[PDB]
Design a protein around this motif. Structure first.
Motif, PDB file in Angstrom:
ATOM      1  N   UNK A   1       5.407 -48.485  27.178  1.00  0.00           N
ATOM      2  CA  UNK A   1       5.588 -47.988  28.617  1.00  0.00           C
ATOM      3  C   UNK A   1       6.499 -47.121  28.918  1.00  0.00           C
ATOM      4  N   UNK A   2       6.313 -46.273  29.743  1.00  0.00           N
ATOM      5  CA  UNK A   2       7.103 -45.250  30.329  1.00  0.00           C
ATOM      6  C   UNK A   2       6.561 -44.794  31.837  1.00  0.00           C
ATOM      7  N   UNK A   3       7.422 -45.413  32.883  1.00  0.00           N
ATOM      8  CA  UNK A   3       6.988 -44.919  34.488  1.00  0.00           C
ATOM      9  C   UNK A   3       7.764 -44.135  34.821  1.00  0.00           C
ATOM     10  N   UNK A   4       8.835 -43.758  33.863  1.00  0.00           N
ATOM     11  CA  UNK A   4       9.826 -42.549  34.594  1.00  0.00           C
ATOM     12  C   UNK A   4       9.278 -41.237  34.760  1.00  0.00           C
ATOM     13  N   UNK A   5      10.031 -40.509  35.996  1.00  0.00           N
ATOM     14  CA  UNK A   5       9.555 -39.259  36.376  1.00  0.00           C
ATOM     15  C   UNK A   5       9.769 -38.196  35.097  1.00  0.00           C
TER      16      UNK A   5
ATOM     17  N   UNK B   1      11.963 -58.679  35.237  1.00  0.00           N
ATOM     18  CA  UNK B   1      11.148 -58.599  36.405  1.00  0.00           C
ATOM     19  C   UNK B   1      11.073 -57.400  36.942  1.00  0.00           C
ATOM     20  N   UNK B   2       9.703 -57.323  37.264  1.00  0.00           N
ATOM     21  CA  UNK B   2       9.205 -55.719  37.707  1.00  0.00           C
ATOM     22  C   UNK B   2       8.452 -56.091  38.961  1.00  0.00           C
ATOM     23  N   UNK B   3       8.302 -54.830  39.804  1.00  0.00           N
ATOM     24  CA  UNK B   3       7.459 -54.885  40.957  1.00  0.00           C
ATOM     25  C   UNK B   3       7.054 -53.448  41.017  1.00  0.00           C
ATOM     26  N   UNK B   4       6.499 -52.887  41.998  1.00  0.00           N
ATOM     27  CA  UNK B   4       5.778 -51.645  42.060  1.00  0.00           C
ATOM     28  C   UNK B   4       4.864 -51.201  41.104  1.00  0.00           C
ATOM     29  N   UNK B   5       5.091 -49.896  40.335  1.00  0.00           N
ATOM     30  CA  UNK B   5       4.122 -49.332  39.527  1.00  0.00           C
ATOM     31  C   UNK B   5       4.418 -50.092  38.203  1.00  0.00           C
ATOM     32  N   UNK B   6       5.525 -50.493  37.914  1.00  0.00           N
ATOM     33  CA  UNK B   6       5.956 -51.117  36.744  1.00  0.00           C
ATOM     34  C   UNK B   6       5.286 -52.408  36.412  1.00  0.00           C
ATOM     35  N   UNK B   7       5.179 -53.334  37.517  1.00  0.00           N
ATOM     36  CA  UNK B   7       4.538 -54.218  37.485  1.00  0.00           C
ATOM     37  C   UNK B   7       2.935 -54.374  37.173  1.00  0.00           C
ATOM     38  N   UNK B   8       2.346 -53.230  37.925  1.00  0.00           N
ATOM     39  CA  UNK B   8       0.930 -53.126  37.733  1.00  0.00           C
ATOM     40  C   UNK B   8       0.764 -52.619  36.480  1.00  0.00           C
ATOM     41  N   UNK B   9       1.648 -51.665  35.906  1.00  0.00           N
ATOM     42  CA  UNK B   9       1.334 -51.174  34.264  1.00  0.00           C
ATOM     43  C   UNK B   9       1.197 -52.207  33.401  1.00  0.00           C
ATOM     44  N   UNK B  10       2.314 -53.089  33.597  1.00  0.00           N
ATOM     45  CA  UNK B  10       2.667 -54.250  32.481  1.00  0.00           C
ATOM     46  C   UNK B  10       1.364 -55.247  32.808  1.00  0.00           C
TER      47      UNK B  10
ATOM     48  N   UNK C   1       1.487 -45.966  29.847  1.00  0.00           N
ATOM     49  CA  UNK C   1       1.250 -46.754  29.156  1.00  0.00           C
ATOM     50  C   UNK C   1       0.118 -47.127  27.927  1.00  0.00           C
ATOM     51  N   UNK C   2       0.322 -47.782  26.801  1.00  0.00           N
ATOM     52  CA  UNK C   2      -0.436 -47.788  25.929  1.00  0.00           C
ATOM     53  C   UNK C   2      -0.577 -49.230  25.051  1.00  0.00           C
ATOM     54  N   UNK C   3      -1.639 -49.741  24.996  1.00  0.00           N
ATOM     55  CA  UNK C   3      -1.784 -51.128  24.158  1.00  0.00           C
ATOM     56  C   UNK C   3      -2.141 -50.825  22.915  1.00  0.00           C
ATOM     57  N   UNK C   4      -1.671 -51.797  21.735  1.00  0.00           N
ATOM     58  CA  UNK C   4      -2.112 -51.477  20.307  1.00  0.00           C
ATOM     59  C   UNK C   4      -3.550 -51.639  20.227  1.00  0.00           C
ATOM     60  N   UNK C   5      -4.154 -52.661  21.261  1.00  0.00           N
ATOM     61  CA  UNK C   5      -5.583 -52.643  21.194  1.00  0.00           C
ATOM     62  C   UNK C   5      -6.415 -51.269  21.017  1.00  0.00           C
ATOM     63  N   UNK C   6      -5.782 -50.531  22.021  1.00  0.00           N
ATOM     64  CA  UNK C   6      -6.412 -49.292  22.355  1.00  0.00           C
ATOM     65  C   UNK C   6      -6.509 -48.136  21.000  1.00  0.00           C
ATOM     66  N   UNK C   7      -5.439 -48.465  20.060  1.00  0.00           N
ATOM     67  CA  UNK C   7      -5.515 -47.654  18.908  1.00  0.00           C
ATOM     68  C   UNK C   7      -5.946 -48.488  17.667  1.00  0.00           C
ATOM     69  N   UNK C   8      -6.784 -49.328  17.958  1.00  0.00           N
ATOM     70  CA  UNK C   8      -7.472 -50.533  16.964  1.00  0.00           C
ATOM     71  C   UNK C   8      -6.581 -51.205  16.256  1.00  0.00           C
ATOM     72  N   UNK C   9      -5.287 -51.563  16.713  1.00  0.00           N
ATOM     73  CA  UNK C   9      -4.423 -52.367  16.423  1.00  0.00           C
ATOM     74  C   UNK C   9      -4.458 -53.488  17.024  1.00  0.00           C
ATOM     75  N   UNK C  10      -4.705 -54.521  16.573  1.00  0.00           N
ATOM     76  CA  UNK C  10      -4.982 -55.876  17.436  1.00  0.00           C
ATOM     77  C   UNK C  10      -3.859 -56.961  17.218  1.00  0.00           C
ATOM     78  N   UNK C  11      -2.664 -56.441  17.507  1.00  0.00           N
ATOM     79  CA  UNK C  11      -1.580 -57.104  17.770  1.00  0.00           C
ATOM     80  C   UNK C  11      -0.718 -56.763  19.053  1.00  0.00           C
TER      81      UNK C  11
END
Ligand SMILES: OCN(O)CCCc1ccccc1
Ligand code: NI
Length: 166
Positions: free
Chosen positions: A60-64, A121-130, A45-55
């Motif tokens: 996300x990609x939680x697939x194997x 609607x998410x659960x497991x790892x996806x919910x946590x990542x979100x 996962x990656x949020x825009x804030x992390x790359x200095x883009x404040x929007x």
């Protein structure tokens, strides 16, 4: 393009993201670069804030197989339930992992890469990542849920890592 990911203790990581006004070519280029950055750094996962883009943009990609792209633009939490916790990592807190409290399941609505609204609607790892990614958009990091001692230790380890890198 691959973007540099901000590391603690950068104050820019505390900035609150503004909503995306329109999902256009500019935003789509940002989304693609964020995915390239996320995959290059081996994150889920990656949020825009992390790359200095404040929007409010999250990829996300939680697939194997690492071939399932999920885009959350202007995400909004609609419902959540239960509690859970796993040892979370973060590209902005390199090589450090810690368990933090999270809702077990969440329901959100957002816009996809095309700007089309959708509900998820998410659960497991996806919910946590979100939840982890949405926290970034409001200037929150997983270490914020830890004790001052735990935080100080994490802080010093990251600074040491970047020291060696430089
Ligand atoms: O902001 C996210 N990032 O830099 C990558 C890792 C995200 C993440 C990793 C493990 C469990 C939950 C979330
Ligand atoms: Ni993170």
């Amino acid at each position: 393009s691959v973007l540099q990911v901000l590391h603690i203790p950068d104050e820019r990581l505390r900035k609150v993201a503004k909503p995306v006004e329109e999902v256009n070519a500019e935003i789509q280029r940002i989304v693609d670069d964020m995915f390239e950055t996320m995959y290059a750094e081996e994150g889920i996962g990656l949020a825009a804030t992390q790359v200095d883009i404040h929007q409010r943009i999250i990829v996300i990609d939680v697939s194997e197989n690492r071939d399932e792209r999920l885009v959350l633009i202007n995400p909004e939490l609609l419902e959540k339930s239960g509690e859970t916790g796993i040892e979370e990592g973060c590209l902005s807190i390199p090589e450090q992992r810690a368990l933090v409290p999270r809702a077990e399941k969440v329901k959100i609505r957002a816009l996809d890469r095309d700007g089309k609204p959708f509900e998820l609607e998410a659960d497991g790892l996806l919910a946590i990542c979100i939840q982890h990614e949405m926290d970034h958009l409001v200037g929150k990091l997983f270490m914020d849920y830890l004790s001052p001692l735990k935080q100080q230790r994490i802080r010093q380890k990251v600074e040491k890592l970047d020291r060696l890198k430089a």
